[PDB]
Structure 1
């Protein structure tokens, strides 16, 4: 229950926590909580505990806390245990994990009562929230603004419920668009015309980059808690569909790529792959799109299932449910775009799926604690050949896995090397075909100096001889020149040409933040982006690199 560098990345269901709940009756031997006491405890539970234990308390990374188990433990045990607090959430907006004596009582009593399941969110609810602001027939037939769309960057202004569209060459903020609250990621249609953003509360906004003044042409709510979205990327299916994944309800939704009309909702509730036991809360994590078949690649966390969903027929729906490893989170395709490599983070494993054949290929331990690749980093190692890399939240290690079964059979799907970067708390590793450098952040590191810097390895100098490759440390936060707080540097993202890499210097909402652009060839500071509108910048997504999956 203490704060580890690799346990702060748990889901904070703060949007779901806003829903009022009715206090249940208490069975013999259990004391009931008033509506207010219960609601106060429920809000705390959803915001700080549900991530590890589940809203239904059936367990996730943390064990189940169902009434039968908790009642056996007793109020005294629960009270004493909860007194120590709980793991802190993500920095800047997350919880501290500290509880008062009054709250420790509410929490202990709450865990002894029978929880209700939060409301479902189906077609009727989605269609009611579905709004087409600009019908397809009323949209332009060609780009009507003069922006360089493919070099645009879509930046999340987290706490402001907005995104900034920034010119990748001039660094001018072309526009700031409202979305509501905390967009998690931006994804582009295969043609690069449509920008899709998903907010943590399940709201999806679709933006037409071809309009003279790009704006939301359609919006829809697909759940109460969501983190993922993706577009159809199979040749011939450009702009056909979009898909969104939710934590609650546990489901994914395929929507029309032009109107956001909800077409197919699929529940992810089901059996765990290994112990084959029913799990009522299998959250949808990363969602990618196949380049080999007209399918979406969906990670189902708690059950350890990777779904290949064929979108050529939504009525006679074909899917391949792949038994993988529990706690699937993020991942990416290799350089050839044929293999999906994903982190089963809590189990320190990388799962590899062949998207052409639709089958599991390998599962390997990285030797590190809690791999968190984001989409990862693909590059040609001088000795090993094609590899994909990931850093870790739990330690300072960077692991490389071979990704070329045809040309380098002996290295394929094997962890070829592991070496240290700046320190623990890493979230994103990055490179680009035109770059000779491998960038690794350390966002969640407890040391300000480290969390504000980035490690950079020279791929060309890598020998794979077993020694630890040296790295240059870029003082990103220092380059941004921010006085107050301990801003955290996060997520490298390259421009279309792969000549410049951007990083977010993430500070609190009422504090100063910035984006730092680094000249990839020289590893020197290129530009510092600051604007009063740039509030809590986090995710950044270059249109071209996102639409083509170039990483």
Structure 2
């Protein structure tokens, strides 16, 4: 129950927490909570508890807290356990997990009551939220602005509920657009025309980059809590579909790539792969798109299943439900784009799927604590050959896995090396084919100087002799020149040419933030992006690198 470096990246269901619930009746031996009391506790539960224990309390990373179990444990036991506080959430916006005496008692009582299941969100609800602002026929048939679309960066302005579209070469903010709250990620259609963003509240906006003044052409809500979205990337299926994944309800939705019409909703409720026990809250995590078959690649967290969803026929729906490892989160494709490599973070494993054959190929422990790759980093190691790398939230380690069964069979799907970077609390590792450098952030590190810096390894100097590769430390936050607070540096993203790498210098909503552009060839400061509209900059996605999965 204490704040660790790798247990702050758990879902915070604060959109779902805004919903009012009814106070349930209490069985013998338990006292009922009033309307206000129950809602107050429920709000606290959804905000700072449901991530680990579930909205239904059936357990996720933390054990089940269902009434049968809690009543047997008792109030006193729960009261004393809960009085210590809960693990803090994410900086600049998460909770500290600090509850008072009034709050501690409420939570213990709440746990003894029978939880109601939050509302579902089906086709009826999605279609009511579905708005097409500019029908396809009224859109341009060619690019009508003079922007360099492929070198554009789509930047989340988290707490402002906006995104910024920034010129990759001039650093000019081309436009700031209103979207869903706290957009989690931006994704691009395969042609690079359409920009899709998903907010944590389940709101999806679709933006047409060919318009003289790009704006939202369609929107829809797919759930109450959502984090992922992806576009069809199989050759021949460019711009055909988009897919969104939600934490609640546990489901994914396949939408029309031009209009966002909801075409197919699939529940992810089901059995765990290992113990084969029903789980009523299997959250959708990362969603990728196959380059080998017309399929979406969907990580289902709590049941530990990777779904290969064939979008060629939504009525006679072909899926492959791959038993993998529980706690699947994020991942990426290898350099050849054939293998999906994903972190079952809580179990410290990397699951490898062959997207061509539709089957599990390997499961390997990284030797680190809580691997968090993002999409990861593919590069050619001088000794090992093609590798994919991940850093970790729980420790300072960077792990390399061999990704070339044909050319380097002895190294394929084995952890080939593990070495330290700046410190624990890393979120994102990054490289590019044109770069000789591997960048590693340390976003969640408790030490301000570490969290405001990035480690940079010289790939060319790597020998894989077992020693610890040296790294250069770039003082990104210092380069940005921010006086107030202790801004967190997060997520490297390259430009189209792979000559410059951008980092977010993420400060609070009413504090000063920036984007820092690094010249990859020299590792020197190229440019500092500051603007009054640049509020809480987090994720940044280069159009070309996102549409092509170049990482």
**TM-score of the pair, normalised by structure 2:** 1.00
CA distance in 2, matches of 1:62, 1:467: 37
| 1:508-529 per-position Cα deviation (integer Å, ceiling 9, x unaligned) | 0010000000000000000000
Pairing 1:439-518 to 2, within 5 Å after superposition: 439-518=439-518
Task: Quote the offset at 1:258 in angstroms.
Answer: 0.1
Task: Confirm or deny: 8 A CA contact 2:180 2:198 kept in the other structure.
Answer: no
Task: Quote the offset at 1:437 in angstroms.
Answer: 0.1
Task: Confirm or deny: 8 A CA contact 2:192 2:543 kept in the other structure.
Answer: yes
CA distance in 2, matches of 1:391, 1:164: 28
CA distance in 2, matches of 1:526, 1:190: 30
CA distance in 2, matches of 1:330, 1:526: 30
CA distance in 2, matches of 1:181, 1:324: 32
Task: Quote the offset at 1:349 in angstroms.
Answer: 0.1
Are 1:358 and 2:361 an aligned pair? no
| 1:390-429 per-position Cα deviation (integer Å, ceiling 9, x unaligned) | 0000000000000000000000000000000000000000
CA distance in 1, matches of 2:355, 2:446: 38
CA distance in 1, matches of 2:93, 2:437: 31
| 1:41-71 per-position Cα deviation (integer Å, ceiling 9, x unaligned) | 0000000000000000000000000000000
| 1:281-331 per-position Cα deviation (integer Å, ceiling 9, x unaligned) | 000000000000000000000000000000000000000000000000000
**TM-score of the pair, normalised by structure 1:** 1.00
CA distance in 2, matches of 1:402, 1:273: 26
Task: Quote the offset at 1:435 in angstroms.
Answer: 0.1
Task: Quote the offset at 1:82 in angstroms.
Answer: 0.3
CA distance in 1, matches of 2:262, 2:180: 20
Q: What root-mean-square deviation, in Å, do the aligned CA atoms of Structure 1 and Structure 2 show?
A: 0.3
CA distance in 2, matches of 1:215, 1:108: 47
SS in 2 for 1:183: coil
CA distance in 1, matches of 2:180, 2:329: 25
**Aligned residue pair count:** 551
Task: Quote the offset at 1:497 in angstroms.
Answer: 0.1
SS in 2 for 1:373: coil
CA distance in 2, matches of 1:143, 1:384: 43
CA distance in 2, matches of 1:120, 1:2: 32
SS in 2 for 1:440: strand
Are 1:415 and 2:415 an aligned pair? yes
Pairing 1:16-415 to 2, within 5 Å after superposition: 16-415=16-415
Task: Quote the offset at 1:357 in angstroms.
Answer: 0.2
CA distance in 2, matches of 1:161, 1:487: 20
CA distance in 1, matches of 2:202, 2:145: 30
CA distance in 1, matches of 2:169, 2:234: 29
CA distance in 1, matches of 2:181, 2:300: 24
Of 256-265 and 176-185, more deviation after overlay is shown by 176-185
CA distance in 2, matches of 1:55, 1:129: 24
Task: Confirm or deny: 8 A CA contact 2:207 2:215 kept in the other structure.
Answer: yes
SS in 1 for 2:142: coil
Task: Confirm or deny: 8 A CA contact 2:500 2:519 kept in the other structure.
Answer: yes
Question: Runs ≥4 in structure 1, deviation > 2 angstroms?
Answer: none
Task: Confirm or deny: 8 A CA contact 2:180 2:204 kept in the other structure.
Answer: no
CA distance in 2, matches of 1:188, 1:476: 27
CA distance in 2, matches of 1:526, 1:77: 56
| 1:417-447 per-position Cα deviation (integer Å, ceiling 9, x unaligned) | 0000000000000000000000000000000
CA distance in 2, matches of 1:538, 1:106: 35
CA distance in 2, matches of 1:327, 1:181: 26
| 1:127-173 per-position Cα deviation (integer Å, ceiling 9, x unaligned) | 00000000000000000000000000000000000000000000000
SS in 1 for 2:219: strand
SS in 1 for 2:171: coil
Task: Quote the offset at 1:72 in angstroms.
Answer: 0.6
SS in 2 for 1:482: coil
SS in 1 for 2:351: strand
SS in 2 for 1:111: helix
CA distance in 1, matches of 2:371, 2:162: 29
CA distance in 2, matches of 1:121, 1:411: 45
SS in 1 for 2:82: helix
Task: Confirm or deny: 8 A CA contact 2:180 2:200 kept in the other structure.
Answer: no
| 1:525-545 per-position Cα deviation (integer Å, ceiling 9, x unaligned) | 000000000000000000000
SS in 2 for 1:46: helix
CA distance in 1, matches of 2:432, 2:277: 41
SS in 1 for 2:112: coil
CA distance in 2, matches of 1:400, 1:115: 43
SS in 2 for 1:44: helix
Task: Quote the offset at 1:180 in angstroms.
Answer: 3.4
Task: Quote the offset at 1:333 in angstroms.
Answer: 0.1
SS in 1 for 2:49: helix
CA distance in 1, matches of 2:169, 2:399: 32
Task: Quote the offset at 1:504 in angstroms.
Answer: 0.1
| 1:250-304 per-position Cα deviation (integer Å, ceiling 9, x unaligned) | 0000000000000000000000000000000000000000000000000000000
SS in 2 for 1:264: strand
Task: Confirm or deny: 8 A CA contact 2:148 2:167 kept in the other structure.
Answer: yes
Task: Confirm or deny: 8 A CA contact 2:180 2:205 kept in the other structure.
Answer: no
SS in 1 for 2:64: coil
Task: Confirm or deny: 8 A CA contact 2:344 2:351 kept in the other structure.
Answer: yes
Task: Quote the offset at 1:26 in angstroms.
Answer: 0.3
SS in 1 for 2:298: strand
Give ranges in structure 1 of 5+ residues lacking alignment.
none
Task: Confirm or deny: 8 A CA contact 2:427 2:443 kept in the other structure.
Answer: yes
CA distance in 2, matches of 1:45, 1:125: 25
CA distance in 1, matches of 2:268, 2:528: 43
Task: Confirm or deny: 8 A CA contact 2:504 2:538 kept in the other structure.
Answer: yes
CA distance in 2, matches of 1:235, 1:65: 46
CA distance in 2, matches of 1:384, 1:221: 45
| 1:424-477 per-position Cα deviation (integer Å, ceiling 9, x unaligned) | 000000000000000000000000000000000000000000000000000000
CA distance in 1, matches of 2:331, 2:420: 20
